[PDB]
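User: Structure with copper (II) ion, tokens only please.
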Amino acid sequence: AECSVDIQGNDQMQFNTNAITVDKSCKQFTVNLSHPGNLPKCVMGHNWVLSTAADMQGVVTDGEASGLDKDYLKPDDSRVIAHTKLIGSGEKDSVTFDVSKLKEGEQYMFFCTFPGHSALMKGTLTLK
Ligand SMILES: [Cu+2]
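Assistant:
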């Protein structure tokens, strides 16, 4: 029925949800990210990245190393299934991905690659 969901990353380094469920009927899925708080992109920026759980660490490691002008994401990274832009306070961004590529029942992981956030800003994403 509904293939979208609005998520938030506040100035406390946290997402307002830690688990997403994609409905079996959804052929594509949308996540609209927004940033409540007062802090700037260089201090408390967030993004939304999807990858398999096993790929997370690498994606972060290389992400952080990728630097800011790169939305803390290795450019052209094959491990990234989907991702938004790194956004600062008072901003928003959205991404819509191809569900047919997802493996039903596989618990994927989504998270922010901004330095030091992933440990606390991560969660599951499962296709029902
Ligand atoms: Cu973050």
